[PDB]
Amino acid sequence: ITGTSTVGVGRGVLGDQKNINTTYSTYYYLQDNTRGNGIFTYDAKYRTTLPGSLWADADNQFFASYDAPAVDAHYYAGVTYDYYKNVHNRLSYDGNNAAIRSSVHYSQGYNNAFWNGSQMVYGDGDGQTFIPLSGGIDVVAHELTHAVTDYTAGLIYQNESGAINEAISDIFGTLVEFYANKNPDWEIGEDVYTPGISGDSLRSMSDPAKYGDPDHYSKRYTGTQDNGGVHINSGIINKAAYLISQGGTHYGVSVVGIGRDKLGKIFYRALTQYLTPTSNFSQLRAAAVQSATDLYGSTSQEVASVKQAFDAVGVK
Numbered sequence: 001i002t003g004t005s006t007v008g009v010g011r012g013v014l015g016d017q018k019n020i021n022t023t024y025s026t027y028y029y030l031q032d033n034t035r036g037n038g039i040f041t042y043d044a045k046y047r048t049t050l051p052g053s054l055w056a057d058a059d060n061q062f063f064a065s066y067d068a069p070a071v072d073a074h075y076y077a078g079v080t081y082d083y084y085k086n087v088h089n090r091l092s093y094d095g096n097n098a099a100i101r102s103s104v105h106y107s108q109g110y111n112n113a114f115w116n117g118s119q120m121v122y123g124d125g126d127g128q129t130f131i132p133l134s135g136g137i138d139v140v141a142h143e144l145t146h147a148v149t150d151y152t153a154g155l156i157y158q159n160e161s162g163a164i165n166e167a168i169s170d171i172f173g174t175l176v177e178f179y180a181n182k183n184p185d186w187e188i189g190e191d192v193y194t195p196g197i198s199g200d201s202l203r204s205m206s207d208p209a210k211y212g213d214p215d216h217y218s219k220r221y222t223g224t225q226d227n228g229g230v231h232i233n234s235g236i237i238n239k240a241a242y243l244i245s246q247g248g249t250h251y252g253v254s255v256v257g258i259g260r261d262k263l264g265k266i267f268y269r270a271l272t273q274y275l276t277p278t279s280n281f282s283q284l285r286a287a288a289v290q291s292a293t294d295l296y297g298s299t300s301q302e303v304a305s306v307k308q309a310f311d312a313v314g315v316k
């Protein structure tokens, strides 16, 4: 909408106060004009018609319980935009400052979040498996990263390419979480998963097997559930990424860690310069090795560590 840029204040899903960029024209809208061609947050009103209505508020204060998922979707989209711009020189998901749109309060008791091809969509959860999913910065960045993938590598959402697609979203979700630097970890969705159970998460990158996800290619799922296991086999790539960054010895194979920033550079380059819609795990290894070679040189520690990590998870 046409209006003047304003700054509202509110509370997110976890009860934390934050400022949000809004737009004033009769109402205050969740429209952040400070980033690209805008970040827009919508109310789906417990229904499934999208996007719903651009979020309107009378007083620019967002402290109601109903407001909380909108505050966080809007704010964490901003953080994710900042990460891609500041760290990778990428302007929004398309590289040309496309408007970023999110809808919250999608459906009823909805235990998921997704990119629908055009926008991000967040359920409120059922209060048992999830609380509103935009409360997780890693979740928001995971979703926006699906848009980045779709505009770049275009990894088909099934089997090995789909598991890479998922892992890319978990990797950058985690790197954005570290970028914001509030309780960062290598777990996925811990802030919004199972409010009645402390210390767990939806997935773990550091130890995928803690939730039954494979951490070695020999343990990959090859059935048809979950688009051929895209949220399961992602553990194999998540583990490799974790090892590249943090190091470790895994099934007897030692990996020298090179840190998060270099992991991000290597995987961003692989995603945008080498991966294709049909890339499999072996092709991802090759893409990561080539990316590290481009950035750091063939004889570098970074290249050696990429090879070690993929060796450790059984991907040749």
Ligand SMILES: CC(C)CNC(=O)[C@H](CC(C)C)NP(=O)(O)CNC(=O)OCc1ccccc1
Pocket (backbone or CB within 6 Å): 111, 112, 113, 114, 115, 116, 117, 133, 138, 139, 142, 143, 146, 157, 188, 189, 202, 231
């Ligand atoms: C068991 C589920 C919770 C799995 N979902 C996830 O792991 C994450 C959310 C977590 C990061 C919290 N959501 P996601 O991977 O974006 C869900 N994916 C998904 O719905 O894809 C299917 C799809 C939807 C719309 C258009 C094309 C294809």
Ligand SMILES: [Ca+2]
Pocket (backbone or CB within 6 Å): 057, 058, 059, 060, 061, 062, 063
């Ligand atoms: Ca208000």
Ligand SMILES: [Ca+2]
Pocket (backbone or CB within 6 Å): 177, 182, 183, 184, 185, 190, 191
């Ligand atoms: Ca965390």
Ligand SMILES: [Ca+2]
Pocket (backbone or CB within 6 Å): 138, 174, 177, 184, 185, 186, 187, 188, 189, 190
């Ligand atoms: Ca996390």
Ligand SMILES: [Ca+2]
Pocket (backbone or CB within 6 Å): 190, 193, 194, 195, 196, 197, 198, 199, 200, 201
């Ligand atoms: Ca929990």
Ligand SMILES: [Zn+2]
Pocket (backbone or CB within 6 Å): 142, 146, 166, 169
């Ligand atoms: Zn995903």
